[PDB]
Amino acid sequence: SNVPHKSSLPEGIRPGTVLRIRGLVPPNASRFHVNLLCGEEQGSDAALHFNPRLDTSEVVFNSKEQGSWGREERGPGVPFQRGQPFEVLIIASDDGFKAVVGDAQYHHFRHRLPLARVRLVEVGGDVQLDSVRIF
């Protein structure tokens, strides 16, 4: 069973915040996601949707605003593998979110929504989480 992991952020997140996600991509994984969302409602606007796609060998970044998706950005290749553990940082600055995978800077996603609207982090899909922490 895939069960979403939710972290409420009722005072939001400010520049200089680190979301640290550790887990395993299980053997039959298709894709999983890390979403920074504006509210608890299903289909909430998203400042960031980070979506490793093992099935298509891509990592997609997008936002959702006023109920519509933005233009996808892609990182280089896919630094995740079925059957292997990973660590991702998502780091908030004034300018955007930096994604770090393993020991490497991976992608910068410029803010599209104001960072102050973020209220929730949801991690789900085909992933077995070790831990999620927000600093």
Residue numbers in the entry: 1 to 135
Reproduce the article's own wording on this structure.
The overall ‘jelly-roll’ fold is conserved compared with the previously obtained native and carbohydrate-bound complex structures. At the N-termini in particular molecule B presented some residual amino acids from the histidine-tag cleavage forming a tail lodging itself between two crystal-related symmetry molecules. Compared with the available structure, residues 1–3 were well ordered in both chains as well as Pro10 and Glu11. The CRD itself remains unchanged despite a slight movement in the adjacent loop composed of Arg74 and Gly75. Six residues showed potential alternate side chain conformation, namely Val18, Leu89, Asp95, Arg110, Arg117 and Arg133. Molecule A had an unusual difference electron density around the buried thiol group (Cys38), which is not conserved among galectins. Cysteine was replaced with an S-oxy cysteine in the structure, with potential oxidation due to radiation damage.
Galectins are members of the carbohydrate-binding lectin family with specificity for β-galactosides. The CRD is about 130 amino acids long, and the β-galactoside binding site is conserved among galectins, while differences both in adjacent β-strands and loop regions explain the variation in oligosaccharide binding affinity. Human galectin-7 (hGal-7) is a 15 kDa prototype galectin with a single CRD, monomeric but capable of dimerization in solution. Consequently galectin-7 has shown major roles in cancer development, by helping either in the elimination of certain tumour types or in the growth stimulation of others.
